[PDB]
Design a binder for this molecule. Structure first.
Ligand SMILES: C[C@H]1NC(=O)c2cc(-c3cccc4c(=O)n(C5(C)CC5)c(NC5(C)CC5)nc34)[nH]c21
Length: 273
């Protein structure tokens, strides 16, 4: 089932998420990624309409893999005795945003605007399909280097979107909002907007703004790089201490700093090729 249909290549990476290998679908040589997760290392489980116990990530990816998007597509999945295996699409050539930022340092605002806009479109798509990622960060974003298109990855910390409080969190701490640090309580959209503020700061400054819990709680933003006043304003708004003071996704995309975004292909020509 798995062995015959996919030819396995080298390990791309491993960590809390499991182990991800490059691969190729044997039938048509389609590039793929193959994610293995041990059953013991999965805490968040869900059920398919069919009535089958699977990892939540499988439920979430099926809900968002409908149509095209800036979300990594689940092509197939398999259950094994002690693990689940997910077959994901693989752009070629590709680089993850963390490595891209590390190599360039801070991104030019024009580039950060295009990237951030695409992340916003992808996150909006997730929320429309009832899915909350809960771990938005540069490490969970891939760049299709030829087309200039960003793709969200790793829904292993995610959940079904709801309007009530979340009391569990498995995402990355330094991207987590002050309300989680202080009260172990947050709401979906406003916590997501906090992580987007951290991401945007990361793009235009070349690193995250807060390291320790006390910096997150204080919420004072210091700019280490030259950043436009409009971009600083949007960042500070996303990082409002009070969740209800943070912008909606609509307010983010109507912010003056977000106007006249480049198309992804233009973005590649000017900034990537
Ligand atoms: C972060 C990890 N967790 C996931 O769910 C997932 C999916 C991928 C993944 C999917 C498709 C393509 C790539 C890919 O090309 N790469 C590269 C080799 C371009 C960086 C990587 N690198 C990572 C983030 C694993 C270390 N992951 C992919 N990586 C992860």
């Amino acid at each position: 089932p798995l062995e015959s249909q996919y030819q396995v290549g080298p390990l791309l990476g491993s960590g809390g998420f499991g182990s991800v290998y490059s691969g190729i679908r044997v039938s048509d040589n389609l590039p793929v990624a193959i994610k293995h997760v041990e059953k013991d290392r999965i805490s968040d489980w869900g059920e398919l309409p069919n009535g089958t116990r699977v990892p939540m990530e499988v439920v979430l990816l099926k809900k968002v893999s409908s149509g095209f998007s800036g979300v990594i597509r689940l092509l197939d999945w398999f259950e094994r005795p002690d693990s689940f295996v997910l077959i994901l699409e693989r752009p070629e050539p590709v680089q993850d945003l963390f490595d891209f930022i590390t190599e360039r340092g801070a991104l030019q605002e024009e580039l950060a605007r295009s990237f951030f806009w695409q992340v916003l479109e992808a996150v909006r798509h997730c929320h429309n399909c009832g899915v909350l990622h809960r771990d938005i960060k540069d490490e969970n974003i891939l760049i299709d280097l030829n087309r200039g298109e960003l793709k969200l990855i790793d829904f292993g910390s995610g959940a079904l979107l709801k309007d009530t409080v979340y009391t569990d969190f498995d995402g990355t701490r330094v991207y987590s909002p002050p309300e989680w640090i202080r009260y172990h309580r947050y709401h979906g959209r406003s916590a997501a907007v906090w992580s987007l503020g951290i991401l945007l700061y990361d793009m235009v400054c070349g690193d995250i703004p807060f390291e320790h819990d006390e910096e997150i709680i204080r919420g004072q933003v210091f700019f280490r790089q030259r950043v436009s006043s409009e971009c600083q304003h949007l960042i500070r708004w996303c990082l409002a201490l009070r969740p209800s003071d943070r912008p909606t996704f609509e307010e983010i995309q109507n912010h003056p700093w977000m106007q006249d975004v480049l198309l992804p292909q233009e973005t590649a020509e000017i900034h990537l090729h």
